[PDB]
Design a binder for this molecule. Structure first.
Ligand SMILES: COC1=C(OC)C(=O)C(C/C=C(\C)CC/C=C(\C)CC/C=C(\C)CC/C=C(/C)CC/C=C(\C)CC/C=C(\C)CC/C=C(\C)CC/C=C(/C)CCC=C(C)C)=C(C)C1=O
Ligand SMILES: CCCCCCCCCCCCCCCCCCCC(=O)O[C@H](COC(=O)CCCCCCCCCCCCCC)COP(=O)(O)OCCN
Ligand SMILES: CCCCCCCCCCCC(=O)SCCNC(=O)CCNC(=O)[C@H](O)C(C)(C)COP(=O)(O)O
Ligand code: SF4
Ligand code: SF4
Ligand code: SF4
Lengths: 169, 63, 324, 157, 83, 63, 185, 108, 385
């Protein structure tokens, strides 16, 4: 028998449930945030914060001399959980072990970074780009020339990201 | 405009405002063009600065 | 006698554009309450957004098979829209800023509001669906139920002024608004107008009507939009009724003979937009209210209490000989 | 007919502006990409700023966002809902699972891409795509809508 | 009840569409699985056709009681629902 | 790298988690009195205004 | 109660014919019983005072395509009162029906339905036993070791008939199986 | 109701076969008028189709295999009864050579 | 009686929800959910991939508590491998599990409020949720599907400035919780839309396997991190809230209290976190440092042999369970002895909760079904594996 039978407290409760005190108290809280500064950002001009460890566009780095870092070790293809990386290799007449077909299906890719952390030569990385939005499906099948173009475009920033977090791991 | 931080070879200019304790309106871009600007014109050097990845301005990142 | 149609168009067209900008204000204010910006990209401050919405709605294929007698479905929007407009022909904006000067003009408003129930009923029935019609019927029952509270509160107001004429009601508020003494009555009238337009926490009837069905009926492209336009026009009308009755219709709020530059036509509009802001605030400050307890509330906390307020006002006025 | 060509150009520009400034996407999120697309509509990366508001029904929605894995049991429903949409009828394939297979891509009950059920116009890749990535994809869709001389094509035909 | 003529006609006419029967073999007394060489599935098929031309049904316990024309058509002629 | 992330010396500042209640607004019979007195005074004012309006109408009729 | 205490008491208290095989370890106490004594053993473990197993965690299933009893359904149980976890498992077959436990734990209905969906092990007197996970018209039981990973049928949209249709599978790129297993292991 | 336990002998298996076939027939008109098909196919030929499908597995000897086949039969029937199978799935599902194979492919 | 069906496309029903229910005109008599619309087929796919390649499947199961499932999988692998974990790794794993608990509780509460009709707390909770999604985006790459927790320790060390920012967030998170609670607990509409709805008794919850908040709502003080504390939880002090009568409102109050307890635990982990290595020195399931694989032959050999073959778990079979925010999340590994799992059944807490919808929605009204859906916090990634 839940009881609140007291002369003074019955008046106090019967007023709160009659003049909407709870409703007014929950109503005046929104008005506090009405005049407060907003938390949104205009996306095209202002970008949201990121991290040096961000996982975005795949890129194929190359040595400062100009020779590509990829040595067709095929660790990235073997570790890739989504099985998105396909590699074909042969020995050039220079005798160097290099790739001829290194294509990533970015529609199968899950952006996990397993491929990036499996390279023994830091050949492939995940750059900070996250703005693919291609209009065609087969444009999303990167084919070792898109990889190298991304590597050339983002090299000055991929190198900074790698050297900043090289102390980790 | 509290501060203007550098420019770009494409013409888009980069600004910066410093808050006190809460995030918001820290750094943004004024794109040079107007034909919908493709939302992607920041180069690699200035891409890290804009997204708070690195504290380097981007002109310093070129050197 | 050929001057009337100019006045009719001058009352109609600003109402439609005000409905559009009221939708924009709804979006913008709900955005600001939730620490957002809302439509900002289009236009300057989102001011061109309703125009883009209208041109987008027009430039779409109309889904109009109507799967029925082809007549009753196209007359319901017409009926609700004409009613929600004709209710505006009696509002005394400032002094001569009134289209019609009905010597009753209040029982007329009650009748027009009560007649605005058939539109949704025949919309639900004509829309051949086993749940859309039922939801429309529950909404009609809700409006019908809160009509009696609206009427009792109107009687409470009418006792003090002594005449039905709307212009005389504002004229009688030179001393005080009628909102200071009848503040509980003002709250009751606001809640009743809020619950009678399905524009409130008192909303669930139609909310579940789309959740369980998805409006898989004959949904015309913008023929359906006349219901939405009429509902928002009713919003504006019942926002203005509160500032006609309980607030000063056009009289200055708290004013010395100093701020006399401004006219009375904007003293009305500022209160109307304040009540509209309160509408949006209440919507984006409270959770929805179930229909099980909607009917019980509307029948057991408003009819007896409004009747008691009628009785108390009448008894107090009679005792001290304070009648008009 | 060069005198009218200005009129057709202005009409086309107005129509494209109307269709771009007000897009009402229909949320079809059914996996973890729906959470990211929900963050996109949240306070930070406001979609409502760009005139984008989600609709609960397909009968009044401009475009459709397919966000999440599309299994075999859901593909008929996706196609049926896509059929009940007006003429413009754009489709955005958010997330890696929606725009071709995904992390699974090898399953008895996974459709290898929503483009095998509905025609997709913009592919937004990522697992899951960032809210900025979805905003960039929607901006790309807006740019695609601008390249529509629909009145001019009707005139020339 | 029902006259023997109509029920006999209806039971000896529908029996001619089983892709194996012969006109010279069908008669008011020609056992299904013995005289006709009918299959058990074919037998339940025939009693099924007896209950398919009309809305009545023969219950489970009355299915394999009599797989012959004589008492089956007697049951048909003693069915109140049939006409 | 001998520079692991961790709390500063002396630990972090103490925090609250116990649902502080602001308890804002008028309490008890304050609102009831403020409403009843307003109602009585407003009714008296309404009676006075009705008397004034009656005088105005009767002088209009006397004209 | 202590894990070894459950071991000793249950082994002593239980009827001897019920438990064919039983195991004690840190991983978990296991009671491998026959296919027909499963219902009785579960009923005993549910109602006994010292061993009050009130909640059934899940009904698992493991396919061993190298033994006569190919499948093996595993019943994970939990005793909330005594804070213990017991595991009962039996052996099944492609055609052998195993008694259900929906009468004891009503939550087991969906797990039994999904076990039937994945492994094709029927359950006796199970109300409304039908496929729960795979789509409508599915052929084959996916979780068997026989079922190919990519399945047998595809799904696409065909324009001549305005509906979504099914075809035998045609993979654009085959699943590349990498054999990393090495000797000296 | 619940799943039947098993069949010890082949007589019970034949009884269950007959019961399943009878139930499938008593369910033949509802699937005729739920998929909106009246003149395209007469109800008669579906009976022959079901009979042929049942007679297909005539060489089965194990009662357990018969029981599980019959259970799959009820599962398919119940799936068809509900408005769950895709449109006209049932009608599509229920309806020398050496040189011919050689001219097409090596795998015949 | 008619039997209409659900399937709304707006995120009210969390999407991908098909509900065929029979009503008596106004009152529902039996609701039969039709799950399977999101059966990707993870259980069959796990068997085909190494113990490391299968970790990100566990991010995609319950995608509001991503690090909670990774915790269960890592604990299962460690229990099968008998691998010790350094204290720093345990502390950071506990910290991120508590962050997942906060995220999941916030999302559940505000989707439930959106279903009821309240709109404002949703946006406030997401502007809060971003401040932890960026914490996730800092330690690892992705904001949502962070493969941070590996079987050995964690993936990689915390950044230098993470602890200060986490403490700064926890300074005001309590006030933010109070602000959100101001509009719901005291509100009278919230009580009338939740009180006496979906009552479950403790015996009946035990019968239907309602481990989680749905169990503690019924008055059972059953917490998996108190009954069977796995990582460093004995050192941390926190209280387990228990409801008095469980009906859609004591569950909400319990979720509020669990958010506050998670905040307390996060503060304790921040204050008590030690320094040391993050990955075990076994080097059979942990890769060498990038500076060591390029200098030492053995380190490069180990890197090569574990990033392709992976570690081989000895042949056994275990069941592990952790207190996921939804409830008892259990992973049952059967190890063949090779480098690939033989069978990995996943005990999703949402399965039993969605099963128990039929009796919870008995003799209720239609508007008292969306509140039942919201109050149990079901996501169909885990329900349909
Ligand atoms: C409920 O869901 C819906 C919405 O979300 C709230 C909409 O915004 C909308 C969009 C509707 C609108 C933007 C209404 C605005 C329409 C118009 C402004 C065109 C009609 C008005 C006129 C022809 C009058 C114009 C004349 C003047 C302004 C006077 C000039 C001096 C619809 C249809 C909807 O169904
Ligand atoms: C400044 C200008 C502002 C202009 C606008 C006016 C202010 C509007 C503010 C509105 C803000 C709240 C809006 C919320 C809308 C939905 C709220 C409805 C909730 C509700 O109906 O509660 C009922 C009480 O309400 C009520 O009773 C309300 C009527 C108030 C009654 C009068 C209270 C004091 C009476 C003293 C009289 C003094 C004079 C005597 C001579 C009973 O709620 P319940 O369901 O819990 O009840 C259990 C019975 N089943
Ligand atoms: C729309 C339709 C819905 C349902 C569609 C279902 C379609 C497939 C139906 C199920 C298919 C099966 O195999 S399920 C039923 C499977 N059962 C058997 O095959 C029994 C083996 N045959 C025998 O026992 C005898 O030879 C017998 C032939 C019976 C009689 O011949 P006799 O008396 O001389 O002996
Ligand atoms: S792991 Fe790196 S170096 Fe080796 S094949 Fe892949 S991209 Fe080339
Ligand atoms: S990010 Fe993961 S899924 Fe994508 S290519 Fe690299 S390893 Fe493969
Ligand atoms: S793309 Fe990634 S996050 Fe999106 S639905 Fe597929 S697995 Fe989930």
């Amino acid at each position: 028998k839940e009881i609140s039978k007291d002369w003074n407290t019955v008046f106090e409760r019967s007023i709160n449930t009659l003049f909407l005190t709870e409703m007014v108290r929950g109503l005046s809280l929104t008005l506090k945030y009405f005049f407060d500064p907003k938390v949104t950002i205009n996306y095209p001009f202002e970008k949201g914060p990121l991290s040096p460890r961000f996982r975005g566009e795949h890129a194929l780095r190359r040595y400062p001399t100009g020779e590509e870092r990829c040595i067709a070790c095929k660790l990235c293809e073997a570790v890739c959980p989504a099985q998105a990386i396909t590699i074909e290799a042969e020995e050039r007449e220079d005798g160097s072990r290099r790739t001829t077909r290194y294509d990533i299906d970015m529609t199968k890719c899950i952006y996990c970074g397993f491929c990036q952390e499996a390279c023994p030569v830091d050949a492939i990385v995940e750059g900070p780009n996250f703005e693919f939005a291609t209009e065609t499906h087969e444009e999303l099948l990167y084919d070792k020339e898109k990889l190298l173009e991304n590597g050339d475009r983002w090299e000055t920033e991929i190198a900074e990201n790698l050297r900043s977090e090289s102390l980790y791991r | 405009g509290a501060t203007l931080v550098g420019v770009d070879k494409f013409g888009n200019k980069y600004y910066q405002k410093l808050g006190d304790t809460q995030y918001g309106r820290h750094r943004w871009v004024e794109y040079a063009s107007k034909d919908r600007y493709n939302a992607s014109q920041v180069p690699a050097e200035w891409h890290g600065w804009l997204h708070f990845i690195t504290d380097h301005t981007g002109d310093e990142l070129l050197s | 006698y050929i001057a009337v149609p100019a006045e009719i168009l001058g009352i109609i067209l600003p109402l439609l554009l005000g409905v559009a900008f009221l939708v924009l204000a709804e979006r913008k204010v709900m955005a600001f309450v939730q620490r957002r910006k809302g439509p900002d990209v289009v236009g300057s401050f989102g001011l061109l957004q309703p125009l883009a919405d209208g041109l987008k709605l027009i430039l779409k294929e109309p889904i109009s098979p109507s799967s029925a007698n082809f007549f009753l479905f196209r007359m319901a929007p017409v009926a609700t829209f004409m009613l929600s407009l004709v209710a505006w022909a009696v509002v005394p904006f400032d002094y001569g800023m009134v289209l019609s000067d009905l010597n009753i003009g209040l029982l007329y408003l009650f009748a027009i509001s009560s007649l605005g129930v058939y539109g949704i009923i025949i919309a639900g029935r004509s829309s051949n669906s086993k749940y859309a019609f039922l939801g429309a019927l529950r909404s009609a029952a809700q409006m019908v139920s809160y009509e009696v509270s609206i009427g009792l509160i109107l009687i409470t107001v009418l006792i003090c002024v002594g005449s039905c004429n709307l212009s005389e009601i504002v004229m009688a508020q030179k001393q005080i608004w009628f909102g200071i003494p009848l503040f509980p009555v003002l709250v009751m009238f606001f809640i009743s107008c809020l619950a009678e337009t399905n524009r409130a926490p008192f909303d669930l009837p139609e909310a579940e009507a789309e959740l369980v069905a998805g409006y898989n009926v004959e949904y015309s492209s913008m023929g359906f939009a006349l219901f939405f336009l009429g509902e928002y026009a009713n919003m504006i009308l019942m926002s203005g009724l509160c500032t006609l009755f309980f607030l000063g219709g056009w009289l200055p709020i708290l004013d010395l003979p100093i701020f006399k530059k401004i006219p009375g036509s904007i003293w009305f509009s500022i209160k109307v937009l304040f009540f509209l802001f309160l509408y949006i605030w209440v919507r984006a400050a409270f959770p929805r209210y179930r229909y099980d307890q909607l009917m019980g509330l509307g029948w057991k906390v408003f009819l007896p209490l409004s009747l008691a307020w009628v009785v108390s006002v009448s008894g107090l006025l009679v005792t001290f000989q304070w009648l008009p | 007919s060069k005198a009218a060509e200005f009129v057709i150009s202005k009409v086309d520009d107005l129509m494209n502006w109307a269709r771009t400034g007000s897009i009402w996407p229909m949320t079809f999120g059914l996996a973890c990409c729906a959470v990211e697309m929900m963050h996109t509509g949240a306070a930070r990366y406001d979609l409502d700023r760009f005139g984008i508001i989600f609709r609960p029904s397909p009968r009044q929605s401009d475009c459709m966002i397919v966000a999440g894995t599309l299994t075999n049991k859901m593909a008929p429903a996706l196609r049926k809902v896509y059929d009940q949409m007006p003429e413009p009828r754009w489709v955005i394939s958010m997330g890696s699972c929606a725009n071709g297979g995904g992390y699974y891509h090898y399953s008895y009950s996974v459709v290898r891409g929503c483009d095998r059920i509905v025609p997709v116009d913009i592919y937004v890749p990522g697992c899951p795509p960032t809210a900025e990535a979805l905003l960039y994809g929607l901006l790309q869709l807006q740019k695609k809508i601008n390249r529509r001389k629909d009145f001019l094509h009707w005139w020339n035909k | 009840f029902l006259d023997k003529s109509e029920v006999t006609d209806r039971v000896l006419s529908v029996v001619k569409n089983f892709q194996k029967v012969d006109p010279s073999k069908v008669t008011p007394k020609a056992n299904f699985q013995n005289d006709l060489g009918l299959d058990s599935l074919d037998s339940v098929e025939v009693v099924m056709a007896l209950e398919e031309e009309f809305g009545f049904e023969i219950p489970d316990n009355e299915a394999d009681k009599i797989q012959s024309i004589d008492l089956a058509v007697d049951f048909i002629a003693s069915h109140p629902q049939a006409k | 790298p001998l520079l692991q992330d961790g709390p500063p010396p002396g630990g972090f500042a103490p925090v609250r988690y116990a649902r502080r209640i602001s308890n804002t607004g008028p309490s008890a019979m304050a609102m009831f009195l403020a409403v009843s007195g307003a109602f009585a005074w407003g009714m008296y004012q309404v009676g006075q205004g009705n008397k004034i309006r009656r005088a105005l109408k009767e002088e209009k009729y006397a004209a | 109660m202590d894990n070894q205490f459950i071991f000793k008491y249950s082994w002593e208290t239980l009827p001897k014919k019920w438990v064919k095989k039983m195991e004690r370890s840190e991983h978990g106490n296991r009671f491998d019983t026959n296919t027909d004594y499963l219902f009785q053993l579960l009923c005993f473990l549910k109602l006994h005072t010292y061993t009050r197993v009130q909640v059934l965690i899940d009904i698992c299933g493991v396919d061993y395509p190298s033994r006569k009893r190919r499948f093996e359904v595993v019943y994970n149980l939990l005793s909330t009162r005594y804070n213990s976890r017991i595991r009962v498992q039996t052996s099944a077959d492609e055609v052998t029906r195993i008694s259900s436990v929906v009468s004891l734990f009503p939550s087991a209905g969906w797990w039994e339905r999904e076990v039937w969906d994945m492994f094709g092990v029927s359950f006796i007197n199970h109300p409304d036993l039908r496929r729960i996970l795979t789509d409508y018209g599915f052929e084959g039981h996916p979780l068997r070791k026989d079922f190919p990973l990519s399945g047998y049928v595809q799904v696409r949209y065909d324009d001549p008939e305005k509906r979504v249709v099914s075809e035998p599978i045609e993979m654009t790129q085959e699943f590349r199986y990498f054999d990393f297993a090495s000797p000296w292991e | 109701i619940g799943v039947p336990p098993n069949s010890a002998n082949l007589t019970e298996a034949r009884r269950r076969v007959f019961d399943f076939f009878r139930a499938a027939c008593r369910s033949i008109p509802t699937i005729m008028d739920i998929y909106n098909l009246q003149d395209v196919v007469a109800p008669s030929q579906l009976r022959y189709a079901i009979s042929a499908q049942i007679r297909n597995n005539a060489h089965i000897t194990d009662p357990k295999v018969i029981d599980l086949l019959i259970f799959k039969g009820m599962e398919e029937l119940t799936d068809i009864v509900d408005h769950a199978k895709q449109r006209h799935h049932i009608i599509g599902q229920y309806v020398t050579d050496f040189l011919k194979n050689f001219y097409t492919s090596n795998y015949f | 009686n008619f039997t209409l069906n659900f399937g709304p496309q707006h995120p009210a029903a969390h999407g991908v929800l098909r509900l065929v229910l029979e009503m008596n005109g106004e009152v529902v008599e039996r609701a039969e959910p039709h799950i399977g619309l999101l059966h990707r087929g993870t259980e069959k796919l796990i068997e085909y991939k190494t113990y490391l390649q299968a970790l990100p499947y566990f991010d995609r199961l319950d995608y509001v508590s991503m690090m909670a499932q990774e915790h269960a999988y890592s604990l299962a692998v460690e229990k099968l491998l008998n691998c010790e974990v350094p204290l720093r790794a345990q502390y950071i794993r506990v910290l991120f599990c508590e962050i997942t608990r906060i995220l999941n509780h916030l999302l559940a509460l505000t989707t439930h409020a959106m279903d009821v009709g309240a709109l404002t707390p949703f946006l406030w909770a997401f502007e809060e949720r971003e401040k932890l999604l960026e914490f996730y985006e800092r330690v690892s790459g992705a904001r949502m599907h962070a493969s941070f927790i590996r079987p050995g320790g964690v993936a990689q060390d915390l950044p230098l400035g993470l602890c200060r920012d986490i403490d700064s967030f926890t300074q005001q998170f309590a006030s933010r919780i109070d602000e959100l609670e101001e509009m719901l607990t005291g509100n009278r509409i919230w009580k009338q839309r939740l009180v006496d709805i979906g009552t479950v008794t403790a015996q009946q919850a035990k019968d239907w396997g309602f481990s989680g908040v749905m169990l503690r709502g019924s008055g059972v003080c059953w917490d998996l991190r108190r009954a069977a504390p796995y990582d460093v939880y004995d050192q941390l002090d926190f209280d387990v809230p228990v409801g008095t009568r469980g009906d859609c409102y004591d569950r909400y109050c319990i979720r509020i209290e669990e958010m506050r307890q998670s905040l307390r635990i996060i503060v304790q982990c921040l204050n008590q976190m030690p320094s040391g290595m993050i990955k075990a020195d076994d080097r059979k399931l942990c890769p060498p440092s990038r500076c060591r694989m390029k200098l030492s032959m053995e380190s490069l050999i180990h890197h090569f042999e574990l990033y392709t073959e992976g570690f081989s778990v000895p042949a056994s079979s275990t069941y592990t369970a952790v207190e996921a925010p939804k409830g008892e999340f259990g992973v049952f590994l059967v190890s063949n002895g090779s480098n690939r799992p033989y069978r990995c059944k996943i005990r999703a807490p949402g399965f039993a909760h969605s099963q128990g919808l039929d009796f919870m929605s008995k003799h209720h009204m239609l508007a008292d079904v969306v509140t039942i859906i919201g109050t149990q916090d079901i996501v169909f990634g885990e329900v349909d594996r």
